[PDB]
Design a protein around this ligand. Structure first.
Ligand SMILES: [Cl-]
Ligand SMILES: [Cl-]
Ligand SMILES: [Mg+2]
Lengths: 204, 125, 233, 195, 222, 211, 221, 195, 195, 195
């Protein structure tokens, strides 16, 4: 009866040279039982990417909520929301439910369309912003991902290299968590192109 | 408790209490065992100086230890009861733990082990 | 299993170039911070060791007797009891460490934190800690209770690493300890103004100072503090 | 309310639901249909807390039937499942949440494709080739992982279901008194009379 | 009510080479949010080319290492100064740990040395004495941070051969002592950054046929 | 996940190699089969220490029987030594799920389930552990008495793989054993990582995962 | 570890930059120094979301108040508004704040606890490192400190927290608010915890990771 | 440790300066004597947060009272304190002593303990966790004492409380309320300890 | 270990015992014999806590088998039941009591009369024409109260048992996987091969 | 409320006479001053049963000590009290003041509080639930006071305690220990109340 570890799963985000990468596992379970191996945890609103770990009902609900909010933003502002601004909107929306929170660990990744600056951020369930140059980690294998990232990561990696580093960070972290794995997706995000790769990993 | 070593060695290397125990056996009524091709028979002598005996109720000389093993004896009748009881308890204990009745060799080895223990335990003959 | 009733607060200590310093205030405290004064929490064992004890006073007095009992026992059939076969800090600590751990393992602990401060036969400084769980550790600075939170940070500015011990004099070390005791008096509700300090020096032996008082306190600035925000008067 | 299964084959969705209703030590009924028709091409099976199950099922049925009249149009299985998920996702932070798990089997007449949705009481929606609720998945998921194919016929799908029910009748402690089976295809919803 | 257990933090790491083995540990001892010591060793030479660490509750750790060192002493007395093989040491420690099955030593134990073929060996134990021989094992507070990195960089897990379409795995091979110490140093600096209970100092004990050598390296003191 | 089943060719024994502490995967390389003697196998489920310690102890008790009685111990007697031992400890918090598998001339191939509650059961098929239900699903569906040795070995291997996939607390590798009159024979360690994809490709099963 | 120190012509606040979830460091360089108003700054300890949210809400309301009154905002306004908000929520909003600033009344230094109690002081410290920080302040603080002395004392008190408290670490953030001058915010004033060069580069050969599928994501309209 | 004493010329309020979280002294120079009006002051004991919240509201009520009806009586100030303490007794832990000077009524002392009751007394002393003492050397207190006598009486009383109670400590603050005006006195440990 | 029944007819005692062994969510075995022969004309069925049942049954079996050898005589069903009751009556005030319920069916060769004894884990002995342990009696006692006669044949007694098992298979939530039936008459103990 | 005070000629022991179960005074003329030897007495506080059991054992130990080794020291009596109180601290709730007169050592006072620790003091006072006070007007106590002074000092101290504490009350009993011998004093409420 700990909402954040019923369904399980992980998200990791990393910055490179004029690029960002965000990756997640595909597992949804009911504690010990694996249910779905196609549960993606990474959504995009224009060019801003959001990964969400935690209680799966809240992951779906928050995706639907931020789609709603960014759709209205675009209609009124007449432009796509930027990562920095979206980060503030996630923080606002979570802290609104301060004493009845969404059991989630969201991660924002994207490139500012004006400045071209790579941007990543993480949050707790009540909307505290962790802004980081290097990397952000979330989910049931966060400890594992912190270890992998802190040792594997170096600054100003090229897209092709950054792909290998984030992939190896996720795969090796998931294999040491019972509630993570069952497949993985990596988004490589450049200024004006985005490649999405499904990784081959052990299915146990 | 009574600790005294009753079974001890003599200068000539004999244990007199064990040897005097064999004399008690020699005094006992004769018991014979003959094993055939597909059977074993146990013959036992009953001294005829006792008339007006009730043969119905008088302790029989051959005792069932289990349904498949029997024990006869020569010597002190009272002493035989203690070995038969211990053997009968060990027979049921073997069935309970090994899920198999004792072999004849095992039941023998147990009874012999009890007899041996009483030759180098304090306070017992 | 028990609950401590009357307790002693922090014991603080550090190594210097030629020995160790240890100090403890002379107070016993009750339940709702009720005070009692006139408790010596520094136990000298021989002329080369001082044992500083915090926690339950009743358990402290039991340990005091065990150490007095230990010195008597060591003398028995020992011609070199006052020389080569005299009790060492390392011996006294290991005894106490053994007792503390077997008492916790019987679920009947001695509700204390102990620091054994002394100089070994070869002149090496000895400073080690043991508590009710039988947990042991050594460091250039050691403190119990509040001392760990407030005294250690101050003492570690003087001796941060092993290489700082030879560069630290007894004058500097004593000043650091005496200053740290004043900070504990400011901020610990279970501390007292009166304290004892012991110095074990390889050259000058054991110096035991009793009925010391915290001096040069800053209170003058209090007159300028009015209300809790908006009050001007 | 215990066993609800679902298999999506090539051209249809098959729902199997246990017939037993057990209150205390007694089996009250052995012919209970744990399903409601939401629309002509969409069926929902349910299991969970007594009362809540039927109350929730009928409430959803009424709302979908209302939409059908208002728009003179059948809502897609994806649309119905999304509506049902949102109702459960509201429930979980209510004063007294609905403790109901559902399978939604539907045939999308626009895509000409069968669709099976699994939603738990928290509002955790997932689309699957085969699904189950509670302890039934402990036995059936391994069997389906082995035998299931995407290009299976309805007959193949019913044989693979018989293998699941036989495994449950062997290894499950409770007598769930067999299953009612319902097929959802392009022609609508029919019940397999004998199983 | 009195709680007989505590957590003294720290983290330990054992790696087995071809003709060598290393057992590393940080030198920080903590309780709650306080530093007890910046240098308190918990990796010990036990004689017979066996290095041991019992990380967790320091009192239980010290007790177990003390008992095992004594077990080695009495093995010499009782068996004509025979060398205690690493496999024999491991089984002995299982009995020491399981002895207190119903009042456990709250520690994670790792021993390193050479097997009877002269090849590097690492054994890891749970608190109640379940044990297993391993090429690689991290224990204690930051085990979760270090262990997946070692899966990747020692056992080459999830690494494939470039251009083979992820069909041919990166081949397993023994690492040099120089390459192993690099992975240990990076493992601990990484764990120091992200785990508050890890830092101050790193002490590595290296075991070869020549004996037991020590190396010390500073870690961040925050 | 552990299983053992009786068939025409003797006994098949298959186990996984995963140990977990909560959601932390502690090991992927655990040996869950105790060898004991050349005609006797023990499987381990529950507490790692409880199983490893007491089944190693069982091997000592079985060796003493054979020195004293000059005969190899029966699977019945070996299983009852372990079941009688755990019963003494009942309520103390021992956690063990176990299968004693062996051949003797007088018994034939025999499997005994023994747990820390003190249950001792003779049976043809058993699956023990968190993933037992997943294993049972595959085994019961394809189990025949007149299975070939090659097919039986595969079914055991396949049934563990099924549980390794679905159960979070099962995985790592599959360890396979075959028990005959001649004795037990090891049929290798099969990493689930490589095995899964091979089985998927060859069998055409596991359609639920990305393909 | 957060501190405030009063000097002759103003007040200085300082903080560490470590965020912790259990024993794990969540953020190695988070900003615990908050701007309520241009010359009123806040150091926050406790729940990180709560200190930011409560600092921004009062900061927003202070800005609107400043516009309405046509006056530079006062610290006692920020203090009163913060304590009344925190009291209302009976400690459930876990914000422990050191509020310092310069206004037309002069320079002020206050602390606020989560339950809504406020204190006045020449030197204050809050958080897990407060006892380590207070030991330094109690040892070295004197009346009539200069600005250079006050910054040194503040940063030293944070350093005591960084080294000795496990709840604190990384860098030292300072904000100096002097009367008749623009508040200067010295982000990463000290950086005494720089990660040493790694022994090895873990840059992988390209193609090392096995890939099942590739696809181009459409992010355009 | 707090007390208020009536004397010939008016009333004196005295308190300690210690604020504790467990055994840690959060503030060693606390001002526990709070102004609710020019010549109506209070001694605060219990929760710092609660007593500050109450004192702020009472100050607001007396400022508004003064605007409409002119200078309020000490009795009126005590009544406002009681109202807040009684009505919110479930959520509040605040023990307050109200002392004030009127030119009509001279020095008055009212105590609002944890109950939320009101009591008018010649003097009052509360020690530890808001514990009010009956008598506390009543032979030491006389009616119409001199200022110098009353300062010495409070200084002695509070010093004895600090001696034996760890929650009390630091400096002794006093506030003298007379026709002459408001005087603030402070006594440092070195003076009051040697008594 | 759930269902144990017993019926005493004119010339015999019939014991029916469920075949299922359930651990957790899985049915481990479907052929389990929950009975031990105590002597050639005395049978004991048992149900309760796992392990305790078999351990208790075998212990009683050993003690009766020991008496039989020692005295070369079969102990009467009344004597065996009294021995078993005393063992359970000791157990209940032990450190860890045996949680086992038993039926003892025997033919007394001296009286030429069948006898059925019901003993619970507390050592509560009672002689009955028909008995059951746990939830079994909830359905069967009403049925037996209606149909039972003292002068029934063994065939009549088996038909009346079929009626009890049919009622249990209908209204009981668990699948107990049928019953093993054993008859105890003047000729000894035999098992009904098909039921 | 109990206290013991050393003076010029010896030592005086003082205590109240009230015994309470909840708010009911079980005994209003209790003798809390107990003889363990001719000139070694104790004040009892805490559990009546516990302090009586301890005092009876200590009296036995000192009677046996006197038989073998002659008149024991006050220190020896205090040690025997501590031993019983420390070793049985888990099961005991007893706060004791030991006062005795030697011709060598004159008046000595030892306190054994709830811990089971021992403390030698010039005087000691315990009030309420065996609560020992540091100082308690140390400026009121001098060394080498006269008997008449010491009686007045105790009478005043205990009367103030009874004033404020409901657990204390009734008569004030005193025992004077000097070379001259043992004197028993009693002071009734009408005398000690008007102080
Ligand atoms: Cl205040
Ligand atoms: Cl009494
Ligand atoms: Mg730190």
């Amino acid at each position: 009866s700990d909402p954040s570890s019923i369904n399980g799963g992980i998200v990791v985000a990393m910055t490179g040279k004029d690029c960002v990468a965000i990756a997640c596992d595909l597992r949804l379970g009911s504690q010990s039982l694996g249910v779905s191996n196609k549960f993606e945890k990474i959504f995009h609103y224009g060019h801003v990417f959001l990964g969400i770990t935690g209680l799966a009902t809240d992951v779906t609900t928050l995706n639907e909520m931020f789609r709603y909010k960014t759709n209205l933003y675009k209609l009124k502002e007449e432009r796509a929301i930027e990562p920095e601004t979206f980060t503030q909107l996630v923080s606002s929306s979570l802290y609104e439910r301060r004493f009845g929170p969404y059991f989630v660990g969201p991660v924002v990744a994207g490139i500012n369309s004006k400045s071209g600056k790579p941007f990543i951020a993480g949050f707790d369930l009540i909307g505290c912003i962790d802004e980081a140059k290097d990397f952000i980690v979330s989910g049931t294998a966060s400890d594992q991902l912190f270890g992998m990232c802190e040792s594997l990561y170096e600054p100003n990696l090229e897209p092709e290299d950054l792909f290998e580093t984030i992939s190896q960070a996720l795969l090796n972290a998931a294999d040491r968590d019972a509630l993570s794995g069952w497949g993985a997706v990596v988004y490589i995000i450049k200024k004006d192109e985005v490649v999405k790769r499904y990784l081959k990993m052990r299915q146990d | 408790g009574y600790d005294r070593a009753l079974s001890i060695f003599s200068p000539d290397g004999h244990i007199f209490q064990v040897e005097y125990a064999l004399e008690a056996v020699k005094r006992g009524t004769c018991a014979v065992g003959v094993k055939g091709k597909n059977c074993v028979v146990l013959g036992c002598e009953r001294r005829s100086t006792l008339k007006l005996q009730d043969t119905r109720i008088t302790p029989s000389k051959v005792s069932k230890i289990d349904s498949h093993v029997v024990l006869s004896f020569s010597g002190l009748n009272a002493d035989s009861r203690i070995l038969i009881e211990k053997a009968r308890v060990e027979a049921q204990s073997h069935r309970l733990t090994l899920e198999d009745p004792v072999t004849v060799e095992y039941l023998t080895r147990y009874v012999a082990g009890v007899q041996q223990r009483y030759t180098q335990s304090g306070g017992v003959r | 299993t028990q609950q401590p009733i009357v307790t002693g607060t922090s014991v603080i200590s550090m190594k210097y170039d030629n020995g160790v310093i240890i100090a403890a205030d002379n107070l016993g405290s009750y339940g709702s911070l009720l005070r009692f004064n006139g408790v010596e929490r520094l136990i000298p064992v021989g002329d080369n060791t001082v044992v500083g004890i915090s926690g339950d006073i009743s358990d402290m007095q039991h340990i005091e007797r065990l150490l007095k009992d230990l010195v008597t026992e060591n003398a028995y059939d020992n011609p070199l009891a006052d020389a080569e076969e005299a009790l060492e800090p390392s011996y006294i600590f290991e005894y106490l460490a053994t007792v503390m751990y077997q008492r916790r393992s019987k679920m009947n602990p001695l509700w204390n934190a102990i620091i054994v401060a002394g100089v070994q036969s070869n002149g090496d400084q000895f400073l080690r800690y043991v508590n009710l769980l039988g947990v042991t550790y050594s460091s250039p600075t050691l403190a119990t209770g509040f001392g760990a939170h407030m005294a250690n940070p101050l003492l570690r500015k003087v001796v941060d690493r092993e290489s700082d011990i030879p560069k630290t004099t007894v004058q500097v070390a004593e000043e650091a300890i005496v200053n740290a005791m004043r900070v504990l008096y400011y901020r610990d509700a279970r501390s007292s103004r009166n304290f004892s300090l012991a110095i074990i020096d390889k050259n000058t032996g054991l110096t035991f100072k009793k009925n010391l008082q915290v001096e040069n306190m800053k209170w003058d600035f209090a007159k300028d503090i009015k209300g809790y925000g908006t009050q001007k008067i | 309310m215990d066993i609800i299964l679902g298999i999506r084959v090539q051209d249809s969705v098959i729902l199997a639901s246990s017939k037993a209703v057990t209150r205390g030590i007694s089996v009250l009924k052995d012919s209970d249909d744990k399903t409601r028709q939401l629309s002509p091409h969409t069926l929902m099976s349910f299991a969970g807390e007594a009362g809540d199950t039927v109350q929730f099922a009928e409430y959803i049925q009424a709302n979908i039937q209302l939409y059908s009249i208002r728009e003179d149009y059948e809502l897609s299985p994806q649309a119905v499942s999304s509506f049902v998920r949102q109702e459960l996702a509201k429930s979980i932070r209510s004063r007294r949440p609905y403790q109901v798990n559902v399978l939604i089997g539907g045939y999308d007449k626009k895509k000409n494709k069968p669709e099976l949705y699994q939603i738990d009481y928290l509002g955790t929606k997932v689309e699957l080739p085969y699904g189950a609720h509670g302890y039934s998945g402990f036995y059936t998921f391994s069997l389906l992982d082995h035998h299931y194919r995407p290009d299976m016929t309805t007959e193949e799908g019913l044989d693979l279901l018989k293998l699941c029910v036989q495994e449950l009748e062997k290894r499950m402690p409770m007598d769930f008194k067999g299953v009612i089976v319902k097929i959802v295809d392009k022609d609508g919803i029919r019940q397999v009379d004998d199983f | 009510q009195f709680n007989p257990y505590g957590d003294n933090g720290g983290t330990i790491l054992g790696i087995a080479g071809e003709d060598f083995a290393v057992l590393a540990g940080d030198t920080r001892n903590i309780t709650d949010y306080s530093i007890n010591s910046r240098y308190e060793p918990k990796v010990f030479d036990c004689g017979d080319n066996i290095v041991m660490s019992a990380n967790g509750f320091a009192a239980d750790g010290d007790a177990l290492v003390k008992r095992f060192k004594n077990s080695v002493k009495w093995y010499h007395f009782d068996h004509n100064d025979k060398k205690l093989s690493i496999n024999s040491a491991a089984r002995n420690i299982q009995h020491l740990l399981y002895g207190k099955r119903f009042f456990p030593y709250y520690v994670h134990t790792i021993i390193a040395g050479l097997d009877e073929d002269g090849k590097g060996a690492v054994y890891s134990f749970d608190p109640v004495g379940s044990y297993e021989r391993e090429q690689c094992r991290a224990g204690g507070a930051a085990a979760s941070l270090i262990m997946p990195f070692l899966d990747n960089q020692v056992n080459f897990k999830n690494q494939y051969e470039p251009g083979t379409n992820g069909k041919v795995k990166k081949p397993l091979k023994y690492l040099s002592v120089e390459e192993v110490i690099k992975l240990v140093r990076d493992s601990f600096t990484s764990a120091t950054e992200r785990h508050i209970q890890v830092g101050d100092g790193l002490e590595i004990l290296i075991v070869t046929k020549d004996g037991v050598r020590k190396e010390f390296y500073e870690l961040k003191r925050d | 996940t552990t299983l053992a089943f009786r068939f025409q060719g003797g006994i098949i024994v298959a186990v996984d190699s995963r140990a977990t502490a909560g959601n932390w995967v502690a090991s992927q390389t655990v040996k869950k089969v105790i060898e004991i003697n050349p005609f006797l196998l023990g499987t381990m489920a529950g507490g790692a220490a409880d199983c490893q310690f007491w089944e190693t102890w069982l091997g000592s008790q079985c060796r003493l029987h054979e020195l004293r009685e000059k005969e190899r111990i029966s699977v019945a007697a070996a299983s009852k030594i372990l079941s009688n031992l755990v019963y003494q400890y009942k309520g103390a918090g021992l956690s063990m799920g176990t299968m004693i598998c062996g051949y003797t001339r007088k018994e034939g191939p025999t499997i005994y389930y023994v747990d820390s509650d003190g249950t001792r059961l003779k049976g043809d098929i058993f699956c023990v552990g968190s993933g037992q239900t997943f294993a049972y699903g595959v085994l019961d569906s394809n189990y025949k008495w007149d299975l070939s040795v090659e097919d039986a070995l595969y079914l055991g291997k396949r049934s563990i793989l099924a549980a390794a996939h679905r159960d979070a607390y099962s995985g790592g590798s599959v360890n396979l054993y075959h028990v005959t009159e001649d004795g037990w024979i090891y049929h290798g360690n099969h990493d689930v990582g490589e095995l899964f994809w091979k089985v998927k490709e060859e069998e055409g099963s596991f359609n639920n995962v990305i393909g | 570890t957060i501190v405030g120190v009063k000097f002759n012509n103003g007040v200085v606040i300082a903080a560490d930059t470590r965020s912790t979830q259990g024993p794990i460091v969540a953020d190695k360089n988070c900003a615990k120094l908050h701007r309520i108003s241009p010359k009123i700054w806040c150091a926050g300890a406790g729940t990180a979301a709560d200190t930011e949210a409560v600092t921004q809400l009062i900061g927003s309301n202070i800005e609107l108040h400043s516009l309405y009154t046509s006056r530079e905002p006062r610290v006692v306004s920020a203090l009163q508004m913060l304590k009344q908000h925190l009291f209302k929520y009976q400690g459930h909003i876990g914000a422990y704040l050191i509020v310092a600033g310069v206004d037309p009344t002069g320079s002020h230094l206050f602390s606020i606890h989560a339950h809504g109690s406020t204190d006045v002081g020449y030197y204050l410290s809050l958080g897990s490192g407060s006892l380590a920080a207070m030991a330094v302040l109690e040892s070295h603080w004197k009346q009539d400190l200069t600005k250079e002395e006050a910054i040194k004392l503040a940063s030293d008190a944070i350093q005591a927290g960084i080294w000795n408290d496990l709840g604190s670490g990384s860098n030292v953030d300072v904000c100096v608010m002097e009367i008749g001058k623009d508040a200067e915010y010295l982000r990463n004033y000290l950086t005494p915890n720089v990660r040493e060069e790694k022994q090895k580069s873990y840059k992988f050969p390209r193609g090392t990771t096995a890939v099942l599928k590739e696809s181009i994501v459409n992010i355009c309209d | 440790s707090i007390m208020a004493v009536t004397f010939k010329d008016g009333v004196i309020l005295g308190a300690d300066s210690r604020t504790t979280t467990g055994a840690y002294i959060a503030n060693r120079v606390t001002d526990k004597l709070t102004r609710v009006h020019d010549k109506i002051w209070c001694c605060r004991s219990g929760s710092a947060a609660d007593t500050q919240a109450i004192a702020d509201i009472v100050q607001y009520h007396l400022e508004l009272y003064t605007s409409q009806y002119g200078t309020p009586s000490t009795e009126t100030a005590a009544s406002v304190f009681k109202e807040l303490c009684y009505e919110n007794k479930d959520n509040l832990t605040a023990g307050i002593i109200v002392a004030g000077y009127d030119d009509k009524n001279k020095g008055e002392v009212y105590t609002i303990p944890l109950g939320g009751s009101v009591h008018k007394l010649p003097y009052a002393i509360a020690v530890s966790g808001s514990t009010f003492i009956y008598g506390y050397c009543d032979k030491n207190f006389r009616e119409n004492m001199s200022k110098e006598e009353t300062v010495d009486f409070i200084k002695h009383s509070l010093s004895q409380a600090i001696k034996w109670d760890g929650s009390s400590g630091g400096v002794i603050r006093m506030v003298v309320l007379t026709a002459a005006g408001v005087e603030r006195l402070i006594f440092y440990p070195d003076e009051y300890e040697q008594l």
